[PDB]
Structure formats: structure tokens, C-alpha cells
């Protein structure tokens, strides 16, 4: 019976690839040949930040495009001001180890967590002097790798137990669990509408999850090694993915195929972070070769390079309005670029 | 209005003074990753220093340590181990007695030594429950030769300091398993990080000083290696 189901899986797995080969009447290599390249991007540091004691791991912009959060592996979560290069808050965490942080679109709360297995949510506009832990969301068996706000109350979490989970912060229990991944989950990417998200884990595959119903509608594969980061294309109907195989792959949700690959012979190091510009032409990919390469998402060409850091580029954000780009690194220095 | 931007600027002065206070305490504390296995007696050592994570702070000579055990998380440790690259020293504890799982401990040690992010971090090896290893060797039914035929043609090293009234057979076993770990360490580590092998047992009233002396050497060597002295 198990053997029969494996044979049916082989019959269906090849049938899935057979459907894509029928759909794949061309590749994006020769479709985008006609368009003129942007050419070089003159991208330079504008507002280099400084103040974290140990390596930063994650950062996140607000909707205002002004305040940014940062986590470092010392137990500090400083909320900066990009415009004035100043610290509005500096939040001492219970656990020193924190692998994630997220700013609410409303800006009311900021979430973070790590090896404690808790997406500890902090309220910025508390009537008291100092900020306090709003609610301890414990329950996951494994380290929390990312958590991101859907809305003021809804929070999506990734973990090292191969499971995503959405929580209700008022009651303090997880509403829906997302099971399916074989390896530990690294990153999340919410849609513009926050109706769907994709989620990469250490299995060289990506799965788009439904937030409400809680089942994987579609799966993507193509990567050779464990996934590191994902971000949606501004459309919401495609996304790129950085992995340890030192290549990024853009995946269309509709076409269900790797449309085109970001490969250079020279690059051998893994990819840590990926992000799009507001237009989505410039795929900002952060490598652990101590720099971040600006990929042409249409032409698969190195548009530009941002050599700013002496250590691994950890995290990389773009502002929602798309004025500026941030990079975090293991040197504890946030560089802002424009 | 311009008044607010001084108020936030003044707010940074109170922020920044608190960061400077936290800077001293951050450098004063030493981070330690405690690694091993369920049967390795990692927690048994922790009980001696009474002074899903388990941190243990112990004060020795007004030097605070932060020994971080990682128990709760899954066995897949290729992605969360990267977070412990700022740590001064990995406390790698091993079960000396269990010959089956020693070779797995050799792979786990070899998996750390050659990692890109863990190449700079020195490993303090603790051969735990040494007393139990000695007692099983004297039985003679459990032979290391079954798991490592290379053991047959291994003599005790000259730089051996056995305790009085010990059987020479145990020291060959005892110094082979160390030497097996150090074979990886020396073959792939050159200035950037060093293995510190140690014997230890349950009856030891120790491992707070012995760790302190090994961490002292790690920090001292960091200075010396700055101006090309090693």
C-alpha cells in the first residue's frame, strides 16, 4: 500500500513537472532581451547608524518609512529614527538571543524572539515610562526564526520546529498552525493585502500558506540548498528567494515555475537576505561575502554592488515608500543607502 | 516645531548613558555554548557551579560567566549554531564511556571546527564521567578496538600525568579518545582557535577554575595574535 502511494506520488510529481513543461513555451532570458538595461546603480551610504553592542540579526521598517527596529544578540532592541539618526527606545529583552523583530503597520507594537521560543511583543506607546512585554507567546518547541504582524492583533511566526503559527495576543494562544515543511523555517513574506504568505524552510522548497483556512495551496522547488530568505514582488503574484546555493530564483505564483535564475560564476557564497524596490526591477540580495549585489530582476545582470560592511550582511530592508534601502551586518552597523 | 527635536535629542542623552552602563556589563560577562548529548552529563557539571534554553551564571574571582545550554530545540543545528559565533568558548562535553556514540561526538566536533562562522571560536573539550570509562575498560568485554582498530597500535603519550594507582590500560584508552579529538583540531586549526581537552568526573569539586584558566588563555591569545606574535 505504501509502495503503491509512492508510485502514485511519482506518477503525479512527474505529471506536475509535465504541466509546467507544456506551460514553458519560452524562458525569460530572451523575452527581456529587447528592453534597455537601467545600467549602473550609483548607490552610496547616506546615514550609517551606530549603537548596537553585538551583531544585529534582523531589522524592519515602519509604514511611516522613518522608524526602524533592530535586534542584536546582546539583549537590546533599539527603535531608531532614520531621519535624525536617534534612539526613541532601547528595549532590554529577557533572553540575549533574538533572531527576529517586526514593526506593526499601525506602529503600536513591536515583536521579537529567538532561542527562548517566544515571539515577545512590546508596546511602544505604554502610558508608563519604560516599555514592558505586552504578552509572552510561548508554545513552540523550537527557536522562532521570524515573526511578522498581519494587523495590530494577528501575528504570523516561523519556528525551528518546521511549523508556522498565527497567534491571538489578547487570549495568548495560537489560532492556526502551519505544518508541511520538513526542515526548520527561516523566513516569511506577507502579501500587500496580507491575505496570503509564503514560507521557506531548510528543505530547498517554498510553500504559500492561507492565513484564514491554514493549508498550503501551492509549493515551489528549484533551489539546491536550504532557503534563507523570501520577499514578495510588489505585484504580490511572484516572489524571489535567496538560498545557500549562492543563487536567487524568482517564482511566479500563477505559472508555478522558476521563471529565471540569478547566477554569476564569481559568486560562490550563500545569500542571507533578499528584497525588492518599490518598482521591483532592482532585486536587492544581501550575501555573506560581506557585500550586497543589486540584481536586475528582468535581465539577470549585476546592476550594482553595495560594499559597506566588514562582516556578513544579515538582514536587508527597503522602505515601503521606496526612498531608501537598509542593510544590517554582523559588525552591528546598520547602513542606509539611497 | 523645533522644540521637539531637542526633546528627542535630550532623550538620546539618557538612552546613550544607559547603553554605556550596559557596555561594561556586556564585556564583563563571558558567553559559553554548552554542547554534548542526553547521556553526556552536561547538566551534571552545571549543578557544581551553584554560584527552551538553560543559562547558568557562576561568579569566579569577580568574573561573571554565562554558560548557555541549548536543550529544548530540535537536533537540526546547522542554522541556530550560527548565533553562537560571538561566544568566547564552546564547552563541548562528551560521554567518555559510550564507545558507540564517541565517533558521533568526533563528527559533531569536526562539524564545529571547520564551520565558516565557528572557525574563530575555541572549543573547551570536557571528557565527562571519566570514572565510568575506567570501570568498563577493566571488564575487557567492551573493547575500543571494535569501534577503532587504530587503538591496537596506540601507546600512551610521553606528556602523560596519570594519578597514582591507575591501570596503564585505561590511560591508553583515556589518552586515545582525547588524541582522536585533537587529531581533527590540529589538522584544520592554525592560530584562529584551539581545542582545550580536559578529564573530569562527577566527584570533581572543580570545572569552575579549570574553565576560568582555559578562557584566560583564549582572551590572552587574542591579544598576542593581534600584533603577529603567534
Amino acid at each position, epitope marked *: 500500500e505504501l509502495d503503491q502511494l509512492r508510485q502514485e506520488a511519482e506518477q503525479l510529481k512527474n505529471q506536475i513537472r509535465d504541466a509546467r513543461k507544456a506551460c514553458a513555451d519560452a524562458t525569460l532570458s530572451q523575452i527581456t532581451n529587447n528592453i534597455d538595461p537601467v545600467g549602473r546603480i550609483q548607490m552610496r551610504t547616506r546615514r550609517t547608524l551606530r549603537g548596537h553592542l553585538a551583531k544585529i540579526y534582523a531589522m524592519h521598517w515602519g509604514t511611516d518609512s522613518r522608524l526602524l527596529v533592530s535586534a542584536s544578540q546582546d539583549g537590546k532592541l533599539i527603535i531608531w529614527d532614520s531621519y535624525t539618526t536617534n534612539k526613541v527606545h532601547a528595549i532590554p529583552l529577557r533572553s540575549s538571543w533574538v533572531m527576529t523583530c517586526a514593526y506593526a503597520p499601525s506602529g503600536n507594537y513591536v515583536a521579537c524572539g529567538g532561542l527562548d521560543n517566544i515571539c515577545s511583543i512590546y508596546n511602544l506607546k505604554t502610558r508608563e515610562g519604560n516599555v514592558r512585554v505586552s504578552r509572552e507567546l510561548a508554545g513552540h518547541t523550537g527557536y522562532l526564526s521570524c515573526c511578522r504582524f498581519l494587523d495590530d492583533n494577528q501575528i504570523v511566526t516561523s519556528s525551528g520546529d518546521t511549523t508556522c503559527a498565527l497567534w491571538d495576543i489578547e487570549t495568548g494562544q495560537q489560532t492556526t498552525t502551519f505544518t508541511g515543511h520538513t526542515g526548520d523555517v527561516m523566513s516569511l513574506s506577507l502579501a500587500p493585502d496580507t491575505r496570503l504568505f509564503v514560507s521557506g524552510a531548510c528543505d530547498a522548497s517554498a510553500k504559500l500558506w492561507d492565513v484564514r483556512e491554514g493549508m498550503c495551496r501551492q509549493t515551489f522547488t528549484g533551489h539546491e540548498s*536550504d532557503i534563507n530568505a523570501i520577499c514578495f514582488f510588489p505585484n504580490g503574484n511572484a516572489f524571489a528567494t535567496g538560498s545557500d546555493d549562492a543563487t536567487c530564483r524568482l517564482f511566479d505564483l500563477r505559472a508555478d515555475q522558476e521563471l529565471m535564475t540569478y547566477s554569476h560564476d564569481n559568486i560562490i557564497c550563500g545569500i542571507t537576505s533578499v528584497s525588492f524596490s518599490k518598482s521591483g526591477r532592482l532585486l536587492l540580495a544581501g550575501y555573506d561575502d560581506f557585500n550586497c549585489n543589486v540584481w536586475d530582476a528582468l535581465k539577470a545582470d549585476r546592476a550594482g554592488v553595495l560594499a559597506g560592511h566588514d562582516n556578513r550582511v544579515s538582514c536587508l530592508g527597503v522602505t515601503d515608500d521606496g526612498m531608501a534601502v537598509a542593510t544590517g551586518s554582523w559588525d552591528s552597523f546598520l547602513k542606509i543607502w539611497n | 516645531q523645533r522644540n521637539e527635536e531637542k526633546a528627542q535629542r535630550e532623550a538620546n542623552k539618557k538612552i546613550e548613558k544607559q547603553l554605556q552602563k550596559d557596555k561594561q556589563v556586556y564585556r564583563a560577562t563571558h558567553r559559553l555554548l554548552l554542547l554534548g548529548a542526553d547521556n553526556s552529563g552536561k547538566s551534571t557539571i552545571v549543578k557544581q557551579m551553584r554560584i527552551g534554553i538553560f543559562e547558568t551564571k557562576f561568579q569566579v574571582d569577580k568574573v561573571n560567566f554565562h554558560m548557555f545550554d541549548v536543550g529544548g530545540q530540535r*537536533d537540526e543545528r546547522r542554522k541556530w549554531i550560527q548565533c553562537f559565533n560571538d561566544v568566547t568558548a564552546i564547552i563541548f562535553v562528551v560521554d567518555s564511556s559510550d564507545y558507540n556514540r564517541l565517533q558521533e561526538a568526533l563528527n559533531l566536533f569536526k562539524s564545529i571546527w571547520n564551520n565558516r562562522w565557528l572557525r574563530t571560536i575555541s572549543v573547551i573539550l570536557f571528557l565527562n564521567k571519566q570514572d565510568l570509562l575506567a570501570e568498563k575498560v577493566l571488564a575487557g568485554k567492551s573493547k575500543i578496538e571494535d569501534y577503532f582498530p587504530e587503538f591496537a597500535r596506540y601507546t600512551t603519550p610521553e606528556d602523560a600525568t596519570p594519578e597514582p594507582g591507575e591501570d596503564p590500560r585505561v590511560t591508553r584508552a583515556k589518552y586515545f579518545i582525547r588524541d582522536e579529538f585533537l587529531r581533527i583540531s590540529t589538522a584544520s586549526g592554525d592560530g584562529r582557535h584551539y581545542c582545550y581537552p580536559h578529564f573530569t568526573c562527577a566527584v570533581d569539586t572543580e570545572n569552575a577554575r579549570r574553565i576560568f584558566n582555559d578562557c584566560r588563555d583564549i582572551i590572552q591569545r587574542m591579544h598576542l595574535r593581534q600584533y603577529e606574535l603567534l
Partner: nanobody
Amino acid sequence: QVQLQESGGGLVQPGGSLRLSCAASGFTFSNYKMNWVRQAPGKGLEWVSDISQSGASISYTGSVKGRFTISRDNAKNTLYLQMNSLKPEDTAVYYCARCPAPFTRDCFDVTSTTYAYRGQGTQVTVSS
């Protein structure tokens, strides 16, 4: 899409030989270091043997050194292993495992419970 398709294994007389072959797909074979792991009935996973990128630095668990011979063909993108004198203890399922990174000297958690880049494995049995 990454697959590892196993071959060989089955019933064989004690002291005999068996040529295992790992058919690798969905990555550049030459770029990754490979590994063998076996699972005994009612026991933990254990490491068997490794291969470098070029296929020079060979190592074994030590219990099976002499009795096993590991190889790779980078030209045909396939991995080999061959036994010499099978013991009753050697009865286990042999999984052909890859490594996470493309230019590393250390593979991490190949012997994990739920590792992703490991084969389904072939049950080798020794009987008369």
C-alpha cells in the same frame, strides 16, 4: 527539484559484497560533498563514509574501514559504494546523503532524524 535515487542492496551471503549506487539529480553533483548513513533496526543513525568535492579526502566510521570502498563519478553525476566482507551487524538501511553547502569542509546534521537531503535508502540484508 532535488532527488536522491538509491540502487542495489538486498539479500547476500555473509562475507560477500554489494555495489550500492546513488543516482543524484536536481543539483550540480561535482559541487557537493556526499556521505553514507545507515539505520540499524531499533537504533540511532550513524555515519559510514564521506567524499570531498574533487573526491580525494575519504574517511570511514572506522568500524568498517577496509571492508567498504567509496567513490564518485563527477562525469556521469553518480555516487558508488562497495562492501568487501559483510557482517551480521551490518544489516541496516543505507541512506545516500548530501551536504548542506557547496564549498565546505564540514557537513552538518547529515545523521539528523528528519534531514531533507537524504535518500529513501536501500535495506541490505545478510542471510543464508
